[PDB]
């Protein structure tokens, strides 16, 4: 009844996919040392 | 001479008297130092 | 019905993201300014242009990070990937600053974009153009402070760096400089953002306090109806109220939110105005006549000549590290310090 | 409505939480990785705590010439020994 | 599969607790490691 | 550079599951 | 002159103040 | 003579050109595809 | 003080220009046909 | 009744008051133009093209028309310095009345279209409404636009029918009046190159005359026209406005970089040639060749041309002004009487040092000595206490070479500290601050002036081509919206296009 | 000070002493501030541009309110047509009392927090401080935009009230 | 309306108000002409930016003398 690959879709994924990989990259930056 | 039909009267209301006053002497009141330097 | 006028009802759908012939140009450029932002503040120094540290990846935080403008010795370089200084290295074009003027130009393209996206939408829906036209402000805003600006100045190097504490540093080196607070199109800028957030407080306040009451709610958002005919709250009420606490009043409601663009909207242009008389150091920095009095009378003394004497402070003591391409020495003994500080 | 799936429904459906149970963590443990494998460093040429100085350098690397600063940056680096 | 299965207010809360989890450990970061003044 | 790859396997892991879940769903639409 | 000039702007703001508020054009309901 | 800049000039210019016409390539083909309907 | 002596007439006409302007639109608009 | 903010709109229906008003704005600028220039002639002292120039008295006109070949008065002197020179009619005098006299021709025609508005010839012949086929007067104007811009390049800027251009050497010494030839290979782009202009002229005014026939022979096709809305004269509004904007921003930019048409003699030097010590390169350059020539250190600084140094010093950067500091530079520093010649700064072992200049950045500035290497040597200190550095305690002195002062040594160390402190402003020049009772406070030059009122017109204009561009394309709708608009067309799925009552 | 420049020398002298400009409290009243500008100059634009048509072109569109009228003047149907599809429709608010109240909430809110920041820096609880934050692996200094804070913020310690401090600490 | 000898030979040039060629026209052409225009100015824009730079041409004061 709802189709699944729209505009929307893409929208959000193009902001979604990079944000969880960056927080990921973050996340481990955390525990750095000099 | 034959009259022109695009004229229009032009009109200002009080409110619109004490606005634009009020823009034009605050705007001195903010300059003048400048212009006194 | 040909081609194009297929690719115009594509673009024009009515879809969760309206897309429009304008997001061509809008979505593009302004998903490269965020992401241009988001992957330097993360990742990327400013070692070789600032000598700073500016991403996550070296420690800052937040309020810390920035994509920092391109090195002095770049002037007003285009500094495209592809350009004459990167030659398309991507990790040295990264070095030199190249994502500065990457979000600076697609960030933009990306304002022209959203403002014809207003023009679109308003003239799809069948309203007039007034948020592309107040939107004009932003613009011009954008354009004096991160274009016109450096372009007046030796480089893009003295733009502002895009991060929170680079900005706080961008006015600060405009006190220190500029004697910005003086400038009087800077002023009426203050004016008309201080004078269009108190429009926003009291003009909400004022119809969330003359609502009729519409329901039996205690809770009163539900006795609205999109689609009711009659206004909301009293307009008589409003106006004898504030007639009689501050002695005038709104009586039209037209005027009123006219007035409500006019006013942020010609702020941000009056300090548009004065940033791009800073591009020259076409200053407000000086009372002639102040200064004449104070050179030939030691005892006279001003609010404007302890400013002054504040500015000097602020020039000689953030120069060195914030100018490092002129390699300044300033000897501790040359340096303006008052009594025991 | 604009005709696309409700959020509300998509992410309280199971099928969404098979998908993204793997599909987040994947990309989470992706940046992780770019990030402790060191070719964050080397991708976007930012220097790691021991390569900001030569040892008994103090003078900042600072990029001085417009046309050959690629090749300035290059000799920074060689600097490192 | 059928929309609606997992409660939203669940999906809230687990979601939720993953943003003060994310932002907890960046605020620890702020005191360990780059950017500790240490 | 092995570690592009270290670094890119859970991404196209990801890509390449998501991708058999939704094949059907996929090929339905289209 | 200065002063005197600076003194002047003030006091014609305030008697606008007065007229803008003593003497404004009735709002009238219709 | 074609300098490296004048070489830098005609990839940044033949780059812009590829990313123009595959996006205007997409979205025609895609407008081709799902019509509106009309009635 | 050594101020700039064009100042004077500088405010003058800056307050005086615009204002007469403005009051000779409100007059005329007054003695209209009510 | 009309707001007071759309009075003018009663002209959007009437071409002939339209045309009047046209000619009463081009008759207050013509009659601008013409009283400006008498003003600057009423001002200007042509006795020292040296340390004097226009550009140090402000001079706004003066240039512009020196730009074209009129550098000649009907009193006998000229703008490069010379003297019983007859430059005709066409003085700085002449360009005045000449502009004056068409102000009131102009004015006239103004009154005359005015009163007889109501010409056949503004009449659609088929509606009897007034009209103006905009798309075939483009065409027209465009046609004489193109034959001018053409005849310009050919003929007056070749010196073939005409006096040529302003053109100088890189350093603005020798600057002249000289017909250029078109420059037709790539450096015609070279914006520093005037072959350049002259070939833009040719060239842009040949391709102004084809276009110009085609929009008179080629109506628009329907669907631009449309577009466009090209029977609604408020949309030739909007985009003129925009490419006036355009044109203000290009001639605010070349006029603070620099190019061909803005040339230093005329305008001040720019800010980046203070930036890159241009000027002092040049100078230090030829004092070495008189060196290695085997000159004394005072002969080579003597063979200094004053106006090469007056170009290194920061008075005449015009990076150094205020925005309420009015009036020529003169007003600020004072008028520039003569080069005090270089100074060279020795500490008591015999080392040169050399004084940091200051930044324009900067609107005061330490002084602070070093060697040829950097390193400080002398200062002069703020806190005395822990003073290292002081001229006192390093003996410094300054001598002269070249200029007024050369051949002199000073030791005492108020004077050594005060030629010290000239020094951070590059070459060091005696002034004449009494004549206008100067007050010492840096201004701009007209450079600066023309750059900031140029930038900032452009961004007004910007506006203007929003408001415009907005009037025209929402025309139906900008005394409110369709009172009777359906809530389906801005509700959400109702319609499959947005706006497009066909697609329910 | 009452007075513009006195109240420039405030700010200086408030950024020297506690780093204002560092402080969240100081950063919410600037987004309440700049907030309340933008949703101003949204809320009118909007409005504006859904005025019902009730005039002619040679009149003020403003003699189309009549004071008093029981009528809305606009239409907020269209007016959020608009903005819903200029951002997405659930970023939009269709209702009126929602709307407003929102206008009063967020400056009104910010404003508070600016008043606590000036009210609660009263008491030396000062802006953030990363001040030499980042060190490399020796022990060097590499210095952020926050240190260039810093050094600005020193000049202006120095300098102000020159003659009043005779020992090293500015404690009040 | 009044007629004038001028007006009467002008008339021509102010008759065919509101005439279009049919449909797009000559729109292709026009965009070619723009395209073209663009690429124009980014190249002299580059040039003067010192992005792009090219033999004998050399964009300074120091260009001729
Ligand atoms: C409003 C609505 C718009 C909406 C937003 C639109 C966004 C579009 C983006 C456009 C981007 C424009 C890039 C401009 C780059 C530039 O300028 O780059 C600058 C170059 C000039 O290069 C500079 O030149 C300087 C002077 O050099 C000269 O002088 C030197 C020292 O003497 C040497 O002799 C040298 O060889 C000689 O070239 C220095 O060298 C600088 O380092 C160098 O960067 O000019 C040039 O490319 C071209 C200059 C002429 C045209 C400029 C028009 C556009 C700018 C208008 C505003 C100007 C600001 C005025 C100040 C107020
Ligand atoms: C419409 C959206 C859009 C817009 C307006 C821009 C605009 C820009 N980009 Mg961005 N970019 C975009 C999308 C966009 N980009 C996308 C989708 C990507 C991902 C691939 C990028 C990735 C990207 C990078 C990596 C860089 C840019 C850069 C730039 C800037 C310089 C571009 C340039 O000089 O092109 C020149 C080309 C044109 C103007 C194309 C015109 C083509 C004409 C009209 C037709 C004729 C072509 C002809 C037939 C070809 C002959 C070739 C032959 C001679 C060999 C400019 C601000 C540069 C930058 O920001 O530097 C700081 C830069 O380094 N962009
Ligand atoms: C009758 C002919 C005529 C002549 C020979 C002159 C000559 C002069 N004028 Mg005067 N002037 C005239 C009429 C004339 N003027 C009129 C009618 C007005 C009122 C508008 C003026 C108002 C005026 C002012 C305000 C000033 C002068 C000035 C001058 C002097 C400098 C010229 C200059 O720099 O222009 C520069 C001209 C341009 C840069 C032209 C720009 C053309 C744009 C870019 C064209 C854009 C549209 C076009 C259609 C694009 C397509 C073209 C196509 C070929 C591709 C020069 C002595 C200056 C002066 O020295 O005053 C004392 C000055 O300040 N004039
Ligand atoms: C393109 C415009 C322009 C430029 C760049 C110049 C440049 C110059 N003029 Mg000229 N001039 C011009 C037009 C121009 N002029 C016009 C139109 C006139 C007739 C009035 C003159 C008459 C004139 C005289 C009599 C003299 C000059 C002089 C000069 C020189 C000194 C400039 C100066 O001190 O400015 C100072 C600039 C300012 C103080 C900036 C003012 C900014 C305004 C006031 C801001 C307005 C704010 C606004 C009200 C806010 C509204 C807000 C609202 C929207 C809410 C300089 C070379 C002087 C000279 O040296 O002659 C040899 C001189 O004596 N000019
Ligand atoms: C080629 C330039 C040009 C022309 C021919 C017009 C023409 C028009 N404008 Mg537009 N406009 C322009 C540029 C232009 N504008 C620019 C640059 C801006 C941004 C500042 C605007 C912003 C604008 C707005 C917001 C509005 C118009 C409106 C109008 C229409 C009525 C104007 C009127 O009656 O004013 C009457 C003006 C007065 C009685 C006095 C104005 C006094 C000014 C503010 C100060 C003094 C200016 C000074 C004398 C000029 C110096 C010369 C200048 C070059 C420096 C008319 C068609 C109006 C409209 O569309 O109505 C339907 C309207 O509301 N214009
Ligand atoms: C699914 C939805 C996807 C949505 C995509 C949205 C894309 C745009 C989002 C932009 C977010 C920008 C903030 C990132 C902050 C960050 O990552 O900090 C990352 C830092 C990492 O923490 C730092 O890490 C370093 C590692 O070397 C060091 O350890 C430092 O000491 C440590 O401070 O976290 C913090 O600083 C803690 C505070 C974070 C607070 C965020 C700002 C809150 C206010 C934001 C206002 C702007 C509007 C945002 C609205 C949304
Ligand atoms: C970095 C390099 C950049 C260079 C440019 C390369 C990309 C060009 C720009 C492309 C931007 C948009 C791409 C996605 C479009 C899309 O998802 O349409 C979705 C369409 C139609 O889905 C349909 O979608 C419709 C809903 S809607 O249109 O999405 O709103 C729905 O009506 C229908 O039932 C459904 O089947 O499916 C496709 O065929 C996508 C083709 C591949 C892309
Ligand atoms: C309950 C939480 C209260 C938080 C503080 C107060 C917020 C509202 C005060 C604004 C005053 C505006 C001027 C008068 C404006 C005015 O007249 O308001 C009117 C408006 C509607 O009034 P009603 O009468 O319908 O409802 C209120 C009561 O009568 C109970 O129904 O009041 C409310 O909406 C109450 C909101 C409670 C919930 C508000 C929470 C919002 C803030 C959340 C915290 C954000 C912090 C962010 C920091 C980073
Ligand atoms: C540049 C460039 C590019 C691009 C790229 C991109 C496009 C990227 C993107 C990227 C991205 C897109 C990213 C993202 C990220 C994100 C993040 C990182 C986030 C974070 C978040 C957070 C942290 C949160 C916070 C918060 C808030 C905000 C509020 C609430 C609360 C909290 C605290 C939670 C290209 C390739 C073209 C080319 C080259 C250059
Ligand atoms: C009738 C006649 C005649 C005569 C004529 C004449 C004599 C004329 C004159 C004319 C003139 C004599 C004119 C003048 C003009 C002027 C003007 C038009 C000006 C304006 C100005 C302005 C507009 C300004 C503004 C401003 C200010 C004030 C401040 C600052 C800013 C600004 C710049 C904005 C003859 C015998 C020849 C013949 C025929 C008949
Ligand atoms: C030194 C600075 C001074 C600045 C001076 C500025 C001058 C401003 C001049 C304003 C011109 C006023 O224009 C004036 O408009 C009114 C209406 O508005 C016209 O009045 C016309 O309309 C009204 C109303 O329908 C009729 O009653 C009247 O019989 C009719 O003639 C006048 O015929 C005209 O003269
Ligand atoms: C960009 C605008 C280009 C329109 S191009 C236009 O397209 C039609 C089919 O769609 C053709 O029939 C027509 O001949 C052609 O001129
Ligand atoms: C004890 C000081 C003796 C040296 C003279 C000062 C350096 S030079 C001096 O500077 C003045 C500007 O300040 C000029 O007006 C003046 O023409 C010039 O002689
Ligand atoms: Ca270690
Ligand atoms: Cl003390
Ligand atoms: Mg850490």
Redesign the interface.
Same mark, same amino acid.
């Given at each position: 009844s709802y189709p699944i690959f729209t505009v929307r879709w893409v929208a959000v994924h193009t902001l979604a996919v990079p944000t969880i990989f960056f927080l990921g990259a973050i996340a481990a930056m955390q525990f750095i040392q000099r | 001479m034959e009259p022109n039909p695009n004229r229009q009267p032009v009109e200002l209301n009080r409110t619109s008297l004490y606005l634009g006053l009020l823009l034009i002497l605050v705007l001195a009141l903010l300059f003048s130092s400048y212009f006194f330097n | 019905r040909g081609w194009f006028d297929i690719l115009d009802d594509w673009l024009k759908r009515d879809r969760f993201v309206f897309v429009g012939w304008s997001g061509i140009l809008l979505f593009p450029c302004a998903y490269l300014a965020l992401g241009g932002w988001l992957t330097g503040t993360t990742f990327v120094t400013s070692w070789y242009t600032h000598g700073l540290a500016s991403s996550y990846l070296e420690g800052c935080n937040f309020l810390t990070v920035a994509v920092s403008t391109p090195a002095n010795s770049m002037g007003h370089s285009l500094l495209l990937l592809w350009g004459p200084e990167a030659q398309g290295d991507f990790t040295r074009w990264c070095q030199l600053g190249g994502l500065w003027t990457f979000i600076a130009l697609h960030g933009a393209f990306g304002l022209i974009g959203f403002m014809l996206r207003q023009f679109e939408i308003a003239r799809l829906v069948g309203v007039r153009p007034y948020n592309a036209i107040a939107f004009s402000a932003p613009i011009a805003v954008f354009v004096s402070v991160f274009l016109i600006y450096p372009l007046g100045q030796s480089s893009w190097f003295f733009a502002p760096s895009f991060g929170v504490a680079a900005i706080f540093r961008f006015l600060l080196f405009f006190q220190g400089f500029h004697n910005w607070t003086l400038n009087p199109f800077h002023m009426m800028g203050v004016a008309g953002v201080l004078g269009g957030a108190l429009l926003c407080a009291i003009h909400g306040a004022t119809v969330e306090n003359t609502l009729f009451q519409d329901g039996e709610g205690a809770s009163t958002f539900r006795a609205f109806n999109p689609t009711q005919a009659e206004e909301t709250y009293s307009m008589v009420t409003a106006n004898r109220f504030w007639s009689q606490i501050f002695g005038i009043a709104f009586s039209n409601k037209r005027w009123l939110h006219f007035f409500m663009l006019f006013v942020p909207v010609t702020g941000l242009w009056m300090s548009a105005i004065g940033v791009v008389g800073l591009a020259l150091n076409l200053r407000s920095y000086d009372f002639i006549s102040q200064e004449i009095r104070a050179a030939e009378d030691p005892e006279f003394e001003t609010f404007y000549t302890k400013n002054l004497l504040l500015n000097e402070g602020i020039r000689a003591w953030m120069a060195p590290q914030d100018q490092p391409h002129e390699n300044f020495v300033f000897p501790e003994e040359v340096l303006p310090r008052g009594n025991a500080l | 409505t604009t005709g696309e799936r409700p959020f509300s429904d998509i992410i309280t459906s199971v099928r969404y939480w098979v998908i993204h149970s793997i599909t987040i963590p994947a990309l989470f443990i992706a940046g992780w990785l770019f990030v402790s494998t060191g070719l964050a460093y080397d991708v976007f040429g930012t220097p790691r705590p021991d390569s900001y100085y030569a040892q008994e350098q103090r003078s900042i690397p600072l990029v001085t010439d417009r046309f050959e600063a690629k090749q300035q940056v290059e000799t920074f680096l060689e600097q490192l020994k | 599969s059928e929309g609606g299965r997992i409660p939203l207010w669940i999906v809230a809360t687990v979601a939720g607790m993953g943003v003060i989890v994310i932002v907890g450990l960046f605020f620890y970061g702020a005191y360990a490691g780059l950017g500790s003044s240490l | 550079?092995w570690? !592009?790859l !270290?670094? @890119?396997?859970? !991404?196209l @892991? =990801? =890509?390449g599951? =998501?991708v058999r879940?939704?094949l059907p769903? =996929?090929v339905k639409?289209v | 002159m200065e002063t005197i000039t600076y003194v002047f702007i003030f006091a014609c703001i305030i008697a606008l103040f007065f007229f803008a508020i003593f003497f404004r054009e009735p709002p009238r309901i219709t | 003579t074609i300098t490296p800049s004048l070489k830098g000039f005609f990839i940044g210019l033949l780059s812009g050109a590829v990313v123009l016409g595959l996006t205007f390539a997409v979205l025609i083909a895609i407008s081709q595809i799902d019509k509106v309907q009309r009635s | 003080m050594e101020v700039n002596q064009l100042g004077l007439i500088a405010t003058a006409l800056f307050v005086l220009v615009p204002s007469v302007f403005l009051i000779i639109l409100y007059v005329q608009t007054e003695s209209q046909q009510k | 009744g009309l707001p007071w903010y759309r009075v003018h709109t009663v002209l959007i229906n009437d071409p002939g008051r339209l045309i009047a008003a046209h000619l009463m704005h081009t008759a207050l600028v013509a009659g601008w133009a013409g009283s400006m220039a008498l003003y600057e002639l009423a001002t200007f002292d042509p006795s020292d093209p040296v340390l004097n120039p226009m550009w140090r008295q402000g001079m706004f006109v003066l240039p512009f028309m020196a730009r074209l070949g009129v550098t000649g008065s009907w009193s006998g002197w000229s703008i490069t310095g010379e003297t019983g020179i007859d430059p005709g009619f066409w003085s700085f005098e002449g360009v005045a009345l000449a502009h004056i006299v068409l102000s009131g021709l102009l004015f006239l025609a103004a009154c005359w279209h005015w009163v007889y508005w109501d010409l056949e010839l503004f009449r659609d012949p088929r509606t009897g409404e007034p009209a103006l086929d905009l798309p075939k007067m483009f065409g027209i104007h465009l046609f004489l636009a193109g034959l001018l811009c053409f005849g310009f390049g050919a003929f007056h800027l070749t010196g073939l029918f005409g006096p040529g251009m302003w053109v100088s050497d890189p350093y603005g010494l020798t600057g002249s009046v000289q017909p250029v030839a078109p420059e037709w290979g790539p450096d015609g782009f070279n914006p520093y190159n005037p072959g350049g202009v002259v070939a833009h002229h040719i060239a842009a005014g040949i391709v102004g005359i084809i276009a110009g026939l085609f929009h008179i022979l080629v109506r628009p096709p329907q669907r631009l026209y449309k577009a466009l809305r090209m029977g609604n004269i408020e949309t030739v509004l909007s985009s003129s406005i925009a490419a006036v904007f355009f044109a203000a921003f290009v001639v605010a930019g070349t006029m603070w970089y620099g190019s061909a048409t803005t040339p230093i003699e005329l305008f001040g030097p720019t800010r980046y040639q203070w930036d890159s010590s241009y000027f002092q390169q040049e100078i230090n350059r030829r004092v070495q060749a008189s060196l290695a020539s085997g000159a004394t250190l005072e002969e080579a600084w003597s063979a200094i041309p004053e106006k090469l140094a007056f170009y290194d010093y920061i008075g005449n950067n015009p990076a150094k002004g205020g925005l309420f500091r009015t009036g020529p530079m003169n007003k600020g520093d004072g008028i520039a009487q003569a080069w005090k010649g270089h100074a060279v700064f020795r500490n008591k072992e015999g080392e040169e040092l050399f004084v940091r200049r200051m930044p324009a950045f900067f609107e005061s500035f330490p002084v602070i000595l070093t060697d040829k290497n950097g390193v400080v040597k002398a200062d002069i200190p703020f806190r005395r206490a822990e003073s290292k550095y002081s001229f006192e305690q390093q003996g410094v002195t300054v001598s002269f070479y070249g200029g007024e002062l050369n051949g002199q040594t000073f030791t005492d160390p108020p004077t050594v500290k005060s030629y010290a402190r000239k020094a951070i402003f590059g070459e060091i020049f005696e002034f004449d601050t009494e004549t206008l009772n100067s007050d010492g406070i840096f201004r701009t030059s007209p450079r600066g002036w023309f750059t900031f009122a140029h930038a900032v017109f452009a961004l007004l204009f910007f506006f203007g081509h929003i408001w415009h561009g907005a009037r025209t394309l929402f025309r139906d709708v900008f005394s409110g919206i369709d009172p009777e608009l359906s809530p389906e067309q801005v509700e959400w799925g109702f319609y499959q296009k947005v706006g497009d009552v066909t697609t329910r | 000070p009452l007075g513009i420049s006195g109240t420039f020398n405030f700010m200086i002298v408030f950024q020297a002493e506690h780093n204002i400009l560092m402080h969240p409290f100081h950063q919410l009243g600037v987004a309440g501030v700049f907030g309340g500008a933008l949703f101003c100059a949204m809320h009118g634009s909007l409005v504006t541009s859904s005025l019902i048509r009730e005039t002619t072109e040679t009149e003020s569109a403003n003699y189309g309110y009549k004071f008093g009228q029981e009528e809305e003047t606009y239409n907020i149907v269209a007016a959020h047509g608009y903005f819903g599809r200029l951002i997405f429709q659930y970023a939009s608010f269709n209702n009126s009392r929602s709307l407003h109240f929102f206008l009063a909430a967020w400056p009104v809110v910010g404003v508070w927090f600016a008043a606590l920041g000036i009210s609660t820096m009263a008491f030396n609880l000062n802006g953030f401080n990363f001040n030499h934050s980042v060190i490399d692996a020796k022990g060097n200094v590499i210095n952020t935009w926050a240190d260039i804070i810093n050094r600005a913020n020193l000049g202006m310690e120095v300098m102000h009230e020159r003659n009043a401090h005779n020992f090293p600490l500015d404690l009040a | 309306a009044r007629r004038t000898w001028l007006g009467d030979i002008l008339r021509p040039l102010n008759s065919e108000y509101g005439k279009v060629a049919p449909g797009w026209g000559t729109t292709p052409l026009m965009a070619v002409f723009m395209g073209l225009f663009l690429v124009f100015l980014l190249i002299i824009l580059e040039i003067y930016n010192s992005t792009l730079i090219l033999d004998g041409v050399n964009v300074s004061w120091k260009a001729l003398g």
């Open positions: - | - | - | - | - | 550079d570690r !592009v !270290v670094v @890119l396997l859970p !991404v @892991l =990801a =890509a599951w =998501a879940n939704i769903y =996929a639409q | - | - | - | - | - | -």
